[PDB]
Amino acid sequence: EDKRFIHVSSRSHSRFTSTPITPNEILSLKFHVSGSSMAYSRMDGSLTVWFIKDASFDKSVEVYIPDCCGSDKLATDLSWNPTSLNQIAVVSNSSEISLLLINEKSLTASKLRTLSLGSKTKVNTCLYDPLGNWLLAATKSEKIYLFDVKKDHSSVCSLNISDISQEDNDVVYSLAWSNGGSHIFIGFKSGYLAILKAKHGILEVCTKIKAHTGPITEIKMDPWGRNFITGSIDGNCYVWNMKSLCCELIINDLNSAVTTLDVCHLGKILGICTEDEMVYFYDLNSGNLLHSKSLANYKTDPVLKFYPDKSWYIMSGKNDTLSNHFVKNEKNL
Template identity: 25%
Template sequence: MPLQSFPTHLKSILSTAHTRELRGHKQKVLTVGWSADGKKLCSGSADQIARVWTNIERTNNRDALELKAHTGEVDQLCWDPTDPERLATASLDSSVIMWDLRSADRSKTAPYIRKVQTSGENINLCWSPDGRNIAVGSKEDVVAFIDTRGGGDSRSEKKYVWHTIKNEVEINEISWNLAGDLFFMTTGQGTVRIVDFPGFKDVLDLRAHTANLYCLDFDPKGRYFATGSADALVCLWDAEEFICLRTFGTLEWPVRTISISHDGELLASGSEDRVIDISSVETGETVHTITCNAATNSIAWHPRQHLLAYAGDDVRSAMPEGNLRVFGFSESVR
């Protein structure tokens, strides 16, 4: 498909878009994510706190809720895809915490509704499309499956884990497909291990990259998924046939994080380069580049608009910064 097939109005939007900075964390931000309705943005930080931003057009933190319960870095977060008021956070403190923002009080804090202890330090997290399960992966490459409905005392630390997968290889990111019948795990061998769900029988070990595979994301329309690797490449795959459709080779360093926009038109990738590449999914060509101060830890497209949240290892004056940014604002809201 020729480059001119890329929608010209999107090029115009990206070329004139501005970035807003959200300040509030005391240490670097490790993870960002939007609620299913796009009305809330959450960030997790090395300061052991998750913050939920409800008015991203403001640069102060007066509208942010604080989620305080972890005793380690908040390394990952994910929202319930069926309920925009619920989210989960995973930490190096070997716990997963589920939150319901409807329980927040006037002090801008929210108590958790359930805390689940896991067997190791947690580094990856995802929520099933039907909202019934959370999967969490640890540094020991164990993936645990948590029943979100649970039972008994909602505040107890009773384990709700109903299944675990012990992998013999390094696991870096995990995800269900959009149908929820397949579960994907990226590995340190450059493959994507795919098992059926909930049976967990091996379906495919997809040879995707020549180096450690760090991240993956699914097209919200269910057509594709993308993978990012230490080989500095992003690959786009057919979600049904598992065939590589094209590669994106703009970045020069390991790709840490990727995200596909709500309309499936744009693929953003962040790495140890000090830029975020935004490319056309259909053509593979770069259509915009965001300059960053440091390596990027996490990026996430808004579920309904061309707004991209991102955060990285910012350091100024030898001090870490706990800021996150949102790119895509028009001149009228600058």
């Protein structure tokens, strides 16, 4: 366990005497279940996929490319494919669902396809199945779609949002696939938790429960399939089990709003990142509020993400934007 620094061009930007803003922003970060790739995305910078073979971080710098999704729009989130190792489903802001390939032998990145279903206003959410047999592209404005991947990317069915809930024009902040791949957990704006059945190609809602009274920010899942953890704009971060669909723990540490939730691959530590530049860690099987660490982050917005294979700690949060990787953190002081 020692502090080791992450070697991208973001550390060279701040090391020079450059005044105004050295990198710009971070939009999304997703892992493939292999646990060796990365989708490090920026706003006007570069979406940089990474492939480090054996060393900690100081082996090689793989690829940075600004002109990957074009030169006019940005990409909301980058979904990796569980079936194909060389496939990343990037969805641009306005009208592009393109599908890219990466090459290890060459310093380039090629594109396999760019399929689109028309009258696409803004698709901001794309995520594959945990087994990699479906793709639910969901707009926050009009309706939610459903495709496949095993034969090709062909549409099957779609559901309009106004049939799910009936209050007002609601925004879909975050939604999450089930762990078997058979259900959809979707998080509304007024604190509704709706459960949609997506077996193979049919999309129908089961029930809706009132989680709390705010925008449900994130929804994560337990690798042992006992429970699922939600976030909030309030201080609440409940833990709902699945066999009875009631609440078990309550993480009542209401000092700010909640922005980022992660779990561990063993399912022990819950990592909550708030808006006062304070991060936490907790326990799932143990009692309610039993911290292991709290860390004061600096003035800018951080992000938090856990590896799928072994417990290694990715935070961001340097002076403008840089990521930190904490090695061998089984104890963490």
